[PDB]
């Protein structure tokens, strides 16, 4: 990555710097904020896997629909259930004391997605 | 005037009794940033034991 002209070097520097905004601002923390134990990386990966599993079911149905209104309606119907579950998860994770509690809440949310979310999605897609 | 009328009696002594926080009895469909409020409520209800 060393060998390049001035323009290429400047472009590479720009691309690198546009990704370090998270690095620069991590030093500027606020004292009065309400801190919470964050969702762990493995739980994040499990939740994203559950979301991808949901997307696996909906893909043929949404790609075989030629109307944007139907796809938007399908998106809205699932999103209400997902938003209720997300609210439960956010409450129970913000009110968490240790990493065990955060893991418990994330596991409950993932289990809700993998157990009831897929059933609800299948019912919606059968309706469509 | 001439039928059943709901009563207005309530709990008027316990502090912060009607600051109800989220639970399975409220379905968690509230304002997103009210989670902080929940924590506050929790703390308050631990102060009065």
């Amino acid at each position: 990555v060393e060998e390049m002209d001035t323009i290429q070097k400047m472009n590479y520097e720009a691309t690198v710097n546009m990704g370090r905004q998270d690095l620069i601002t991590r030093e500027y923390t606020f004292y009065s904020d309400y801190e919470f134990i964050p969702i762990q990386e493995d739980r994040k990966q499990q939740m994203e896997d559950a979301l991808n599993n949901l997307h696996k079911i909906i893909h043929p149905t949404v790609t075989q629909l030629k109307k944007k209104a139907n796809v938007q309606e399908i998106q809205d119907r699932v999103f209400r259930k997902l938003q209720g579950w997300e609210g439960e998860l956010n409450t129970c994770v913000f009110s968490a004391k240790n990493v065990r509690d955060s893991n418990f809440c994330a596991d409950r949310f993932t289990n809700r997605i993998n157990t009831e979310g897929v059933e609800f999605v299948k019912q919606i897609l059968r309706e469509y | 005037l001439f039928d059943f009328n709901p009563s207005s009696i309530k709990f008027e002594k316990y502090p912060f009794y009607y600051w109800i926080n989220s639970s399975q009895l409220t379905e968690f469909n509230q304002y997103r940033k009210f989670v902080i409020r929940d924590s506050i409520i929790y703390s308050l209800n631990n102060y009065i034991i």
Binding site: C92, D101, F104 | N21, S23, Y42
Partner: peptide, 28 residues
């Protein structure tokens, strides 16, 4: 709000175990 099961102190169970054998709560 719900208390998580691992953070839940079964104080009701502790009082229940301390009840006499011939008790209305045990009958319930």
């Amino acid at each position: 709000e719900m208390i998580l099961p691992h953070n839940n102190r079964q104080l009701a169970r502790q009082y229940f175990d301390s009840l006499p054998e011939n008790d209305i709560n045990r009958k319930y």
